Design a protein around this motif. Structure first.
Motif, mmCIF file in Angstrom:
data_model
loop_
_atom_site.group_PDB
_atom_site.id
_atom_site.type_symbol
_atom_site.label_atom_id
_atom_site.label_comp_id
_atom_site.label_asym_id
_atom_site.label_seq_id
_atom_site.Cartn_x
_atom_site.Cartn_y
_atom_site.Cartn_z
ATOM 1 N N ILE A 45 0.799 -1.223 0.000
ATOM 2 C CA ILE A 45 0.000 0.000 0.000
ATOM 3 C C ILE A 45 0.838 1.282 0.000
ATOM 4 O O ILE A 45 0.291 2.384 0.133
ATOM 5 C CB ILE A 45 -1.020 0.015 1.152
ATOM 6 C CG1 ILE A 45 -0.312 0.157 2.506
ATOM 7 C CG2 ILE A 45 -1.918 -1.218 1.073
ATOM 8 C CD1 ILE A 45 -1.242 0.273 3.687
ATOM 9 N N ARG A 46 2.150 1.139 -0.180
ATOM 10 C CA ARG A 46 3.062 2.284 -0.164
ATOM 11 C C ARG A 46 2.919 3.196 -1.376
ATOM 12 O O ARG A 46 2.426 2.800 -2.428
ATOM 13 C CB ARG A 46 4.509 1.806 -0.064
ATOM 14 C CG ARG A 46 4.836 1.150 1.272
ATOM 15 C CD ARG A 46 6.239 0.603 1.289
ATOM 16 N NE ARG A 46 6.385 -0.443 0.288
ATOM 17 C CZ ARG A 46 7.542 -0.865 -0.206
ATOM 18 N NH1 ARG A 46 8.686 -0.348 0.222
ATOM 19 N NH2 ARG A 46 7.548 -1.821 -1.119
ATOM 20 N N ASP A 47 3.368 4.432 -1.202
ATOM 21 C CA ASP A 47 3.515 5.358 -2.305
ATOM 22 C C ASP A 47 4.563 4.776 -3.274
ATOM 23 O O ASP A 47 5.548 4.166 -2.833
ATOM 24 C CB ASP A 47 3.954 6.714 -1.743
ATOM 25 C CG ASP A 47 4.099 7.782 -2.806
ATOM 26 O OD1 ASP A 47 5.097 7.765 -3.552
ATOM 27 O OD2 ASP A 47 3.221 8.666 -2.887
ATOM 28 N N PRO A 48 4.361 4.941 -4.594
ATOM 29 C CA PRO A 48 5.306 4.378 -5.567
ATOM 30 C C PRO A 48 6.749 4.864 -5.388
ATOM 31 O O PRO A 48 7.689 4.162 -5.774
ATOM 32 C CB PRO A 48 4.742 4.852 -6.916
ATOM 33 C CG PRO A 48 3.887 6.030 -6.580
ATOM 34 C CD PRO A 48 3.271 5.666 -5.273
ATOM 35 N N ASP A 54 13.088 1.595 -2.088
ATOM 36 C CA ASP A 54 13.393 0.499 -1.170
ATOM 37 C C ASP A 54 13.189 -0.905 -1.736
ATOM 38 O O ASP A 54 13.642 -1.885 -1.137
ATOM 39 C CB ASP A 54 12.574 0.663 0.116
ATOM 40 C CG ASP A 54 12.973 1.894 0.913
ATOM 41 O OD1 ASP A 54 14.180 2.218 0.958
ATOM 42 O OD2 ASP A 54 12.077 2.532 1.504
ATOM 43 N N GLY A 55 12.520 -1.006 -2.878
ATOM 44 C CA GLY A 55 12.119 -2.303 -3.416
ATOM 45 C C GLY A 55 10.810 -2.772 -2.804
ATOM 46 O O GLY A 55 10.148 -2.019 -2.078
ATOM 47 N N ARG A 65 -2.722 3.075 -0.399
ATOM 48 C CA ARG A 65 -3.734 3.055 0.640
ATOM 49 C C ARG A 65 -4.913 3.962 0.292
ATOM 50 O O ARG A 65 -6.068 3.604 0.530
ATOM 51 C CB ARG A 65 -3.143 3.418 2.001
ATOM 52 C CG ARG A 65 -4.198 3.503 3.088
ATOM 53 C CD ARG A 65 -3.639 3.625 4.510
ATOM 54 N NE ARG A 65 -4.773 3.902 5.395
ATOM 55 C CZ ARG A 65 -5.036 5.069 5.978
ATOM 56 N NH1 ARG A 65 -4.183 6.082 5.909
ATOM 57 N NH2 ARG A 65 -6.150 5.209 6.683
ATOM 58 N N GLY A 66 -4.621 5.113 -0.307
ATOM 59 C CA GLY A 66 -5.653 6.090 -0.618
ATOM 60 C C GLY A 66 -6.636 5.672 -1.694
ATOM 61 O O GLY A 66 -7.681 6.308 -1.844
ATOM 62 N N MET A 67 -6.311 4.608 -2.430
ATOM 63 C CA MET A 67 -7.186 4.063 -3.474
ATOM 64 C C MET A 67 -7.918 2.796 -3.054
ATOM 65 O O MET A 67 -8.758 2.284 -3.807
ATOM 66 C CB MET A 67 -6.357 3.732 -4.709
ATOM 67 C CG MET A 67 -5.863 4.955 -5.412
ATOM 68 S SD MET A 67 -5.010 4.538 -7.063
ATOM 69 C CE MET A 67 -4.278 6.309 -7.405
ATOM 70 N N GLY A 95 6.324 0.642 7.668
ATOM 71 C CA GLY A 95 6.589 0.406 9.087
ATOM 72 C C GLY A 95 5.497 -0.295 9.868
ATOM 73 O O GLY A 95 5.640 -0.513 11.073
ATOM 74 N N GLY A 96 4.409 -0.656 9.196
ATOM 75 C CA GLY A 96 3.331 -1.415 9.826
ATOM 76 C C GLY A 96 2.102 -0.619 10.238
ATOM 77 O O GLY A 96 1.068 -1.202 10.566
ATOM 78 N N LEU A 97 2.184 0.709 10.201
ATOM 79 C CA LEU A 97 1.097 1.538 10.731
ATOM 80 C C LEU A 97 -0.030 1.761 9.727
ATOM 81 O O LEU A 97 -1.175 1.414 10.009
ATOM 82 C CB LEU A 97 1.624 2.857 11.308
ATOM 83 C CG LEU A 97 2.731 2.733 12.368
ATOM 84 C CD1 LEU A 97 3.054 4.088 12.976
ATOM 85 C CD2 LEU A 97 2.387 1.728 13.469
ATOM 86 N N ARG A 98 0.286 2.318 8.556
ATOM 87 C CA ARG A 98 -0.713 2.490 7.497
ATOM 88 C C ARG A 98 -1.397 1.170 7.187
ATOM 89 O O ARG A 98 -2.598 1.126 6.928
ATOM 90 C CB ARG A 98 -0.084 3.036 6.210
ATOM 91 C CG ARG A 98 0.128 4.534 6.176
ATOM 92 C CD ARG A 98 0.962 4.929 4.964
ATOM 93 N NE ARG A 98 2.343 4.477 5.112
ATOM 94 C CZ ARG A 98 3.252 4.418 4.144
ATOM 95 N NH1 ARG A 98 2.944 4.739 2.893
ATOM 96 N NH2 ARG A 98 4.480 4.003 4.432
#
Ligand code: NA
Length: 132
Positions: A45-48, A54-55, A65-67, A95-98
């Motif tokens: 769900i990360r930003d591209p 980071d891979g 996440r926003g979609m 990091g597990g939060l979003r």
């Protein structure tokens, strides 16, 4: 001027999410991936721009996440059929939060079963998990 007053913050949101969802340990998530992750969809769900830097977990499906709601809901014009599959959906972020919030949102919608990866991709990387 007087600052904005936040009365419901991430602490409250995360508590509600954490106590309602499966937190999959980093080691268990890595073992799941190595097994072939049968009947599992791992959702990044990360930003591209995070992903580029980071891979990612190999074979993961990217949905920011926003979609999420717009891709999960089959009645959305933007529905993605992967979210209709009879599988466990494991969400991850940096990091597990979003991803706790995302898993809770998905579960609230009716997606089942869901989980997120403890400590996110950061913990995955630290443990030497598979990376693309
Ligand atoms: Na939990």
């Amino acid at each position: 001027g007087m600052p904005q007053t936040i009365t419901r913050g991430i602490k409250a949101m995360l508590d509600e999410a954490n106590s309602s969802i499966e937190t999959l340990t980093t080691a268990d998530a890595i073992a799941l991936h190595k097994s072939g992750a049968s009947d599992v969809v791992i959702v990044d769900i990360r930003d591209p721009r995070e992903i580029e830097r980071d891979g990612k977990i190999p074979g993961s499906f990217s949905c920011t996440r926003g979609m999420l709601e717009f891709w999960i809901d089959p009645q959305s014009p933007y529905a993605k059929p992967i979210f209709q599959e009879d599988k466990k959906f494991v969400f991850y972020c940096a990091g597990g939060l979003r991803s706790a919030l995302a898993a809770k949102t998905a579960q609230d919608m009716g997606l089942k079963p869901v989980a997120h990866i403890e400590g996110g991709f950061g913990a995955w990387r630290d443990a030497g998990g598979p990376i693309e």
